[PDB]
Amino acid sequence: VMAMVGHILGLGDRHCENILLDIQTGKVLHVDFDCLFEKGKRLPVPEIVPFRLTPNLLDALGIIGTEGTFKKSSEVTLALMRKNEVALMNVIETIMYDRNMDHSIQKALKVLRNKIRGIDPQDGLVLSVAGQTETLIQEATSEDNLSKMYIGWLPFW
């Protein structure tokens, strides 16, 4: 849930000190959030990211790799987030406010809102649940993207 909501926010730069894991019950969270809206791509050491996923998570998730309750959580998460995203749009209006950022603009926030709605990379036919789930999964499992980023984000960790 936190993993795809981060890339929905356009988070990036998920260095491996940012996974947080309790040994009580294994609940995961990203905590950092100190960089957003394309701070790996148009920033040096170009870090075009699907989102953070470690291939060594996949055996530990089970025999079925990542193809499971991961995927169902992704389905229900997207089905919830595309029910009331205009309230989420009202929340992320507060984000924009770029004392942090250079030229992330209001129209860039509308482009973000288009991404939140389901506007594909210049494409239609938006299934937005199984299709977008398969989009995130089979873009994170793309090993060329796993190789084409900096090994400060060493992906197998």
Q: Provide, rounded to whole angstroms, the least separation between the CB of residue 154 and its own copies.
A: 23
Alpha-helical (H) ranges within the chain are: 2-9, 58-61, 69-81, 85-93, 106-117, 130-140, 143-147
100 lines the binding site for its own copies (CB under 8 A): no
Read off the amino acid at residue 123: D
In the complex with ligand ANP, the residue whose CB is nearer, 17 or 143, is: 17
**The two three-digit tokens of residue 53, written as one number:** 């996923």
Please name the residue that has the structure tokens 């960089």: 35
22 lines the binding site for ligand ANP (CB under 6 A): no
Distance between CA 30 and CA 3 in Å, rounded? 8
Q: Provide, rounded to whole angstroms, the least separation between the CB of residue 9 and its own copies.
A: 17
Report yes or no: 95 and 36 within 8 Å, Cβ to Cβ.
yes
Distance between CA 141 and CA 62 in Å, rounded? 16
Of the ranges 5-13, 36-44, 46-54, 125-133, which one interacts with its own copies (CB under 8 A)? 125-133
How many of the chain's residues bind ligand ANP (CB under 6 A)? Answer: 3
Q: Provide, rounded to whole angstroms, the least separation between the CB of residue 93 and its own copies.
A: 6
Q: Which residues pair with 95 in a beta bridge?
A: none
31 lines the binding site for ligand ANP (CB under 6 A): yes
21 lines the binding site for ligand ANP (CB under 6 A): no
**The two three-digit tokens of residue 129, written as one number:** 């649940």
Residue numbers at the binding site for its own copies (CB under 8 A): 59, 62-65, 67-69, 71-72, 84, 86-87, 90-91, 93-94, 117-119, 121-122, 124, 126-127, 130-131, 134-135, 138-139
- Residues within the interface to ligand ANP (CB under 6 A): 17, 20, 31
